Amino acid sequence: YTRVVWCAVGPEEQKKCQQWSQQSGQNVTCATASTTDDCIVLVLKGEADALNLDGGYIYTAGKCGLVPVLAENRKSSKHSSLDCVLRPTEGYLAVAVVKKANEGLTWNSLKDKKSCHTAVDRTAGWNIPMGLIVNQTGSCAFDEFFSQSCAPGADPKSRLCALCAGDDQGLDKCVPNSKEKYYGYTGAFRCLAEDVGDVAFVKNDTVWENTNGESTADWAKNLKREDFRLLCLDGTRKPVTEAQSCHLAVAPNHAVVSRSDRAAHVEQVLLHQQALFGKNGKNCPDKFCLFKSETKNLLFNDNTECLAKLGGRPTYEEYLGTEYVTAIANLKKCSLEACA
Numbered sequence: 462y463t464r465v466v467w468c469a470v471g472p473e474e475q476k477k478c479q480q481w482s483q484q485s486g487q488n489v490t491c492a493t494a495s496t497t498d499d500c501i502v503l504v505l506k507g508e509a510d511a512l513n514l515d516g517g518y519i520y521t522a523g524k525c526g527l528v529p530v531l532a533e534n535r536k537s538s539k540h541s542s543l544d545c546v547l548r549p550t551e552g553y554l555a556v557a558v559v560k561k562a563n564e565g566l567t568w569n570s571l572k573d574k575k576s577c578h579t580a581v582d583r584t585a586g587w588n589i590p591m592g593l594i595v596n597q598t599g600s601c602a603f604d605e606f607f608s609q610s611c612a613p614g615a616d617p618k619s620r621l622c623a624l625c626a627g628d629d630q631g632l633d634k635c636v637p638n639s640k641e642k643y644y645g646y647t648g649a650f651r652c653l654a655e656d657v658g659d660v661a662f663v664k665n666d667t668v669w670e671n672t673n674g675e676s677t678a679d680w681a682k683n684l685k686r687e688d689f690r691l692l693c694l695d696g697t698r699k700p701v702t703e704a705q706s707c708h709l710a711v712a713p714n715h716a717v718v719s720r721s722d723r724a725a726h727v728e729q730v731l732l733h734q735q736a737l738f739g740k741n742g743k744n745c746p747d748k749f750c751l752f753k754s755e756t757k758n759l760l761f762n763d764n765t766e767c768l769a770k771l772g773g774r775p776t777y778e779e780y781l782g783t784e785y786v787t788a789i790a791n792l793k794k795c796s797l798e799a800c801a
């Protein structure tokens with residue numbers, strides 16, 4: 462009744478949730494699935510209450526009646542006077558990254574190169590990039606643009622999974638969850654750092670968070686920003702400090718979604734939950750922090766300051782914005798539970 466059932470995607474996320482459930486005294490319990498879409502089915506079924514989602518999945522859920530409840534908010538310099546829970550969300554920059562040593566690689570010479578995506582159906586890792594590529598290309602054969610890629614979610618036998626690696630033993634190749642070495646923002650970036658792929662479709666924050674000694678992770682401790690470049694849409698190549706003038710798009714922050722007849726309940730518990738394990742919670746540092754997972758973005762991106770109220774009690778289309786919504790629609794033209 463006053464308890465929330467969260468849906469975790471994959472084994473690593475289920476571990477962090479179990480910990481969260483334990484520290485909350487059952488105020489929050491977990492449900493597990495192997496993929497985000499399965500997590501959405503559980504929520505529709507009623508066996509799970511909520512889960513945080515990238516804009517790409519919100520589109521999907523939205524059609525199935527789910528609704529955004531709260532959104533993640535990272536630290537910004539403008540809009541200082543206002544608290545985090547009430548402050549407007551700015552969204553993030555989807556960028557295309559490359560190794561600087563890869564001279565001559567530009568947005569115009571990407572065909573047949575090797576791409577690293579966060580996962581199919583995600584904003585910065587799939588929808589924005591393949592969206593632009595389907596339009597400029599005029600074709601729907603985005604499955605043939607790149608020679609080889611790693612796009613968690615696609616057919617394991619296809620070229621779109623050729624570069625993925627699976628887990629420690631090579632099992633779960635290409636599964637859209639943290640078990641895949643190259644899954645998500647971090648996964649896709651590693652995919653480039655290790656020179657597996659030629660280009661990685663992530664977000665501006667990912668580069669910074671994993672370069673210049675910010676990650677301490679063995680595959681990223683020796684990473685230096687200067688050795689990276691962004692691919693702008695005009696054919697130019699700018700430093701990672703010029704993200705504001707060289708990005709593919711601004712994307713809507715990830716957000717917690719739930720069934721509408723529960724949104725109120727999910728919100729109440731969450732706000733309270735975050736006042737205890739949030740950025741400045743009564744018990745985050747000492748006992749448990751909802752927004753930490755040592756660079757893996759488990760349940761929430763590690764750069765989340767807090768979960769913000771929406772205000773305007775927005776529908777999923779409104780939340781995602783008309784801009785992004787068409788982009789997705791146009792792309793989906795090329796391809797219950799896809800509830801319309």
Ligand SMILES: *[C@@H]1O[C@H](CO)[C@@H](O[C@@H]2O[C@H](CO)[C@@H](O[C@@H]3O[C@H](CO)[C@@H](O[C@@H]4O[C@H](CO)[C@@H](O)[C@H](O)[C@@H]4O)[C@H](O)[C@@H]3O)[C@H](O)[C@H]2NC(C)=O)[C@H](O)[C@H]1NC(C)=O
Nearest residue numbers: 536537538554665666667669670675702703704705706764
């Ligand atoms: C692209 O993405 C990057 C990464 O998110 C953005 O860079 C961050 O931007 C913020 C806001 O402009 C900037 O403000 C400072 O935040 C610091 C915390 O990161 C604060 O102090 C510093 O904290 C560091 C982290 O603990 C610490 O290592 C350092 O010693 C110092 O204490 C500071 O008070 C400011 O608020 C961040 O510094 C910056 N973070 C990083 C890692 O660079 C960047 O703005 C994005 N670009 C665009 C176009 O949006």
Ligand SMILES: *[C@@H]1O[C@H](CO)[C@@H](O[C@@H]2O[C@H](CO)[C@@H](O[C@@H]3O[C@H](CO)[C@@H](O)[C@H](O)[C@@H]3O)[C@H](O)[C@H]2NC(C)=O)[C@H](O)[C@H]1NC(C)=O
Nearest residue numbers: 588589590591592593595596783784785787788789790791
């Ligand atoms: C890929 O190409 C498609 C096809 O053009 C792009 O869709 C088009 O997107 C623009 C801008 O979002 C739409 O224009 C808007 O039209 C509405 C009224 O329909 C108007 O009120 C706005 O001021 C604006 O002019 C356009 O309608 C839409 N075309 C169709 C038929 O869907 C799509 O955005 C491109 N995708 C990417 C990732 O760039």
Ligand SMILES: *[C@@H]1O[C@H](CO)[C@@H](O[C@@H]2O[C@H](CO)[C@@H](O)[C@H](O)[C@H]2NC(C)=O)[C@H](O)[C@H]1NC(C)=O
Nearest residue numbers: 463464483484485486487488489730733734737
């Ligand atoms: C777990 O959730 C319960 C329910 O909200 C919390 O207990 C409540 O504490 C507030 C503040 O004292 C009271 O207004 C409620 O009446 C209490 N619930 C009841 C009916 O006993 C509890 O604080 C939460 N603990 C954790 C770890 O999150």
Ligand SMILES: CC(=O)N[C@@H]1[C@@H](O)[C@H](O)[C@@H](CO)O[C@H]1O
Nearest residue numbers: 551552711712713714780781782
């Ligand atoms: C114009 C713009 O910045 N795009 C916004 C994005 O920042 C925001 O996160 C999202 C959710 O409302 O809606 C988009 O339209």
Ligand SMILES: [Fe+3]
Nearest residue numbers: 515516584585
């Ligand atoms: Fe995203």
Ligand SMILES: [Zn+2]
Nearest residue numbers: 708709710711
């Ligand atoms: Zn822009």
Ligand SMILES: [Zn+2]
Nearest residue numbers: 774775776779
């Ligand atoms: Zn409205």
